[PDB]
Structure 1
Amino acid sequence: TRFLRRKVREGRLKKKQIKFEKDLKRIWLKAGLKEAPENWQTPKIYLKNK
């Protein structure tokens, strides 16, 4: 069932990225900023970047 494991792995990592992105949005919104800091783009750290 490895095919499913890769499918589960790629969908688990996508949720892991959304949780990372959402956690970053919570911080600046709580601080009182209405938009993310200028020139900031959340890094994609769980994708096939390497």
Structure 2
Amino acid sequence: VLKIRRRKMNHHKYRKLVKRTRFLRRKVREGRLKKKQIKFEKDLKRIWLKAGLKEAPENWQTPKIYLKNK
């Protein structure tokens, strides 16, 4: 009885909280994805540098997979 009411009341307070801070969350996300991309690029640079290459493989450009490509 009170367990769905509490899920409902808890879920109600989260949707209200998300609405109040919707714009802040958007800027948080765009920055979390940018860090997620830099971490991806750096992890790829580590690989070729460890292998002994001084420059990335010819004709290679790290794909931007977290940007608004779709």
TM-score (normalised: structure 1): 0.99
Deviation at 1:17, TM superposition (A): 0.0
How many residues align? The count is: 50
**Percent of aligned positions that are identical:** 100
Deviation at 1:9, TM superposition (A): 0.3
After superposition, what is the alpha-carbon deviation per residue over 1:8-38, rounded to whole angstroms, capped at 9, x for unaligned? 0000000000000000000000000000000
| Unmatched tracts of structure 2, length 5 or more | 1-20
| Unmatched tracts of structure 1, length 5 or more | none
Greater relative contact order (CA < 8 Å, ≥ 6 in sequence) = 1
Structure 1 stretches (4+) deviating beyond 6 angstroms?
A: none
Structure-2 separation of matches of 1:4 and 1:42 = 29
> RMSD of the alignment, in Å?
0.2
Deviation at 1:7, TM superposition (A): 0.2
